[PDB]
A paper describes a structure:
In the human pathogen Vibrio cholerae, the sodium-pumping NADH:quinone oxidoreductase (Na+-NQR) generates a sodium gradient by a so far unknown mechanism. Na+-NQR is composed of three integral membrane subunits, NqrB, NqrD, and NqrE, and three hydrophilic subunits, NqrA, NqrC, and NqrF. The six subunits NqrA, B, C, D, E, and F of Na+-NQR harbor a unique set of cofactors that shuttle the electrons from NADH twice across the membrane to quinone. Here we show that ion pumping in Na+-NQR is driven by large conformational changes coupling electron transfer to ion translocation.
Subunit NqrF consists of two domains, an amino-terminal [2Fe-2S] ferredoxin-like and a carboxy-terminal FAD-binding domain, which is similar to ferredoxin-NADPH reductases (FNRs). Both domains are connected by a flexible linker and are anchored in the membrane by a single N-terminal transmembrane helix. The C-terminal FNR-like domain catalyzes NADH oxidation, and the electrons are transferred via the ferredoxin-like domain to the integral membrane subunits NqrD and NqrE. The mode of NADH binding was further characterized by X-ray structures of the isolated FNR-like domain of NqrF, as well as of a variant of NqrF lacking the C-terminal F406, which is important for binding of NADH. Once NADH binds to the FNR-like domain of NqrF, it is oxidized at FADNqrF; this is followed by fast electron transfer to [2Fe-2S]NqrF in the ferredoxin-like domain of NqrF.
Author numbering: 129 to 407
The structure:
């Protein structure tokens, strides 16, 4: 049942301004027996970390400097635990990959404490230990032949990647599949080579990214605006049977609400709407 692993951090690089990909090596090269969409728990001891010690690459530091985010510190005097979704799929053996947003204090409340566990995770470097437990889960794919529409935003990426690779690689699915991902700007995109490669290799999979706040330096000529509107205008509006698809979503609360509203207005039933709310 519930097992615990004292893992070793392989890498903990930024994938976006405010997202790190934590890669963990499982002891003895064993694999966590998880399902795509599932999660583990990370636990951490009492500790004290400083944002100034974070490894944030130059290309991502712009908004860190703009909003003086390196000011922050997190002192935690009790053990803590949190859930994080796997970004790897089950046959990426011997590892656990996470996509962790740094939960800074809100702008209108800049002096409340920073997020406890995400600050701790962003402190980790290669060779550090990280204890996880699980696996757990409920955000699982349905076992049908229905067309799948995956809708991700921001820091909701991880279960989308896990799901999509699980279908196309482990299950060798022939189901029609698409992924619609909303990012603020081009530097906030990630897993581009992974999804481009899957799309190129699988005639039943395509993906699209929309930028809601494209930046002058992005030279962006792709889709813009909120991902739900892009998905509607460029695919679902013309679809002959949107109610016949299964929708799997993980994104900001406002994205989830806009998506659900749009789908219900197309006649999609709740049975066909699955989402993972991180709380
Ligand atoms: C099943 C599941 C899967 C998940 N998967 C992911 C995932 O893939 N990636 C991911 O990034 N997260 C994921 N989460 C969320 C994750 O578990 C944490 O909730 C998240 O990392 C924030 O926790 P934290 O300890 O860093 O912040 P907390 O310490 O819980 O704080 C949250 C926020 O509250 C703010 N805050 C603190 N005090 C105050 C105050 N007085 N007034 C106002 N605001 C205040 C903090 O600054 C911070 O912004 C998942 C959650 C679940 C349940
Ligand atoms: N940890 C995170 O996920 C953070 C995300 N951001 C996001 O970056 C974008 C910044 O937009 P820009 O066009 O560059 O500038 P801007 O000044 O126009 O940003 C607009 C909003 O950024 C918000 N913001 C969110 N987190 C903030 C933080 N920690 N400190 C200060 N302001 C914060 C403020 O409410 C402001 O209203 C916003 O989308 C903001 O939400 C910014 C800071 C941290
Ligand atoms: N599954 C969950 O519960 C998740 C929750 N979040 C939370 O959502 C907030 C924003 O997270 P970020 O990763 O910085 O996202 P973000 O601010 O970078 O937004 C990501 C994408 O979401 C869509 N979106 C954002 N605001 C929207 C709105 N008002 N209407 C419609 N679509 C919108 C856009 O397509 C945007 O590109 C944070 O508080 C984060 O904790 C984020 C991701 C997943
Ligand atoms: Na990026
Ligand atoms: Na394709």
């Amino acid at each position: 049942m519930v097992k615990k692993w004292e893992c070793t951090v392989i890498s903990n690089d930024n994938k976006a301004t405010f997202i790190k990909e934590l890669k963990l090596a499982i002891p003895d090269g064993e694999s966590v027996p998880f399902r795509a969409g599932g999660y583990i728990q990370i636990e951490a001891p009492a500790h004290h970390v400083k944002y100034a010690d974070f490894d944030v690459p130059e290309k991502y530091r712009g908004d860190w400097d703009k909003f003086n985010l390196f000011r922050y510190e997190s002192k935690v005097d009790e053990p803590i635990i949190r859930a994080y979704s796997m970004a790897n799929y089950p046959e990426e053996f011997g590892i656990i990959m996470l996509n962790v947003r740094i939960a800074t204090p809100p702008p209108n409340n800049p002096n409340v404490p920073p997020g406890q566990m995400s600050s701790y995770i962003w402190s980790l470097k290669a060779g550090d230990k990280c204890t996880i437990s699980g696996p757990f889960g409920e955000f699982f794919a349905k076992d049908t032949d229905a067309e799948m529409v995956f809708i991700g935003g921001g820091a909701g990426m991880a279960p989308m990647r896990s799901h999509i690779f699980d279908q196309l690689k482990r299950l060798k699915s022939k189901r029609k599949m698409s992924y619609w991902y909303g990012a603020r700007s081009k530097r906030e995109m990630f897993y581009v080579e992974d999804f481009d490669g899957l799309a190129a290799e699988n005639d039943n999979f395509v993906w699209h990214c929309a930028l809601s706040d494209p930046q002058p330096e992005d030279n962006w000529t792709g889709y813009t605006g909120f991902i739900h509107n892009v998905l509607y205008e460029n695919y679902l509006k013309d679809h002959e049977a949107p109610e016949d698809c299964e929708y799997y979503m993980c994104g900001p609360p406002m994205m989830n609400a806009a998506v659900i509203n749009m789908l219900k207005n197309l006649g999609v039933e709740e049975e066909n709407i699955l989402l993972d709310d991180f709380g």
